[PDB]
Structures are given as C-alpha cells and as structure tokens.
Amino acid sequence: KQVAGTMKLELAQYREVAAFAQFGSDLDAATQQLLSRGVRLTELLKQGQYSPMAIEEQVAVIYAGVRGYLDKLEPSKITKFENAFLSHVISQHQALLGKIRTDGKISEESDAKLKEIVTNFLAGFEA
C-alpha cells in the first residue's frame, strides 16, 4: 500500500501522454519526465513465468522505479536488470528483504541501503 498508490498515479498520468511518446522530440521537460517514468514502471510490471514473488521482493522493485532510480537506464535493459538485481538481493541482502517484511514497510534505513545497492548495481549492469 505504500508503493502501489504512487505507481498507479504515475502510470495513469503516463497513459494520457503515451500516444506521442515517439512523436515528441521538442515537447517540454515536464511531459518528458512523465514519459520517462512511464515506460520504466511499465517495464517493472513485466514478469517471467513460474517464479511468483514474495511481497517484500515486489515492493523492493516497485520502490526502485517509484522513487526514481532507473530513469537513466535504457528501457530495453530493465527486464534483464531486474532478473540480475533480484537474484542479487535474494542471495546477498536477505537481511534487507526481511526488514521490509518484519517491519511491514521500507524505512529510512532500508531506503538508504536500497539506494546504495540499486545505483551501484545499475552502473555495472549498463556497461
């Protein structure tokens, strides 16, 4: 509930502008940002088959797009990014995922740790 609301609103605002996502090279930054957040959140809603996700794993990916950490990442790379990112956090940051579960939200401590992991992980992946 702490992330689904924001995502719902940003995708709704994106759907109003999405038709000319490829027909707006000179439109202003405000609507450029709506489009940029737009097909990033859309990529984060893509999912493979036969591996349903625990709620804390879901919100950790949804938070990363919502709080803006993937806005500079090439659209086409997001699905392959998440696969790598999720494998990495499950294996190495189970303590982090537990904190989002035991405490039932993403705290400031969790937010700071997720920022460090996502941003540094993003730079390695886009190479």
Partner 1 sequence: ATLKDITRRLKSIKNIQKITKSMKMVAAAKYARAERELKPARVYGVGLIIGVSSDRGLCGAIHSSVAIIGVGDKIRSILTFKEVGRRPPTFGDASVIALELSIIFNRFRSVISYKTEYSLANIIYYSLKESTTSEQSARMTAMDNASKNASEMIDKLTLTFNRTRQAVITKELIEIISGAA
Partner 2 sequence: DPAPATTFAHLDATTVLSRAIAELGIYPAVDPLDSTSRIMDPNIVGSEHYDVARGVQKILQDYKSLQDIIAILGMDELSEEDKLTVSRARKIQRFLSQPFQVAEVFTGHLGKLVPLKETIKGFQQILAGEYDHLPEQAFYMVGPIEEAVAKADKLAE
Binding residues for ATP: 47, 49
Residues 3, 124: Cα–Cα separation, whole Å: 26
Among 4, 9, 27, 123, binds partner 1 (CB under 8 A): 27
- Tokens 């493979």: give the residue: 48
d(CA 29, CA 26): 9
From 19-27, 40-48, 65-73, 96-104, span contacting partner 1 (CB under 8 A): 19-27
In 3D, which of 52, 62, 107, 54 has the Cα closest to residue 82? 62
Which residues line the annotated binding site? 47, 49
Shortest distance (Å) from residue 36 CB to partner 2: 14
Instruction: Quote the least distance from Cβ 35 to partner 1, whole Å.
Output: 11
**Residue of 1, 12, 19, 49 that binds partner 1 (CB under 8 A):** 19
**What is the contact surface with partner 2 in residues (CB under 8 A)?**
22-23, 25
Contacts of 104 (CB under 8 A, 6+ apart): none
- When asked if residue 28 is in the footprint of partner 1 (CB under 8 A), the reply is yes
Q: Which is nearer to partner 1, 19 or 127 (CB)?
A: 19
15 binds partner 1 (CB under 8 A): no
Token representation of residue 78: 């997001």
User: Quick check: 26 binds partner 1 (CB under 8 A)?
Assistant: yes
Angle of helix 55-66 relative to helix 29-43, nearest 10 degrees, comes to: 160
Residue 51 site contact among partner 2, partner 1, none (CB < 5 to 8 Å, cut-off depends on kind): none
* Cα atoms found within 13 Å of the Cα of residue 61, Cβ hemisphere only: 26
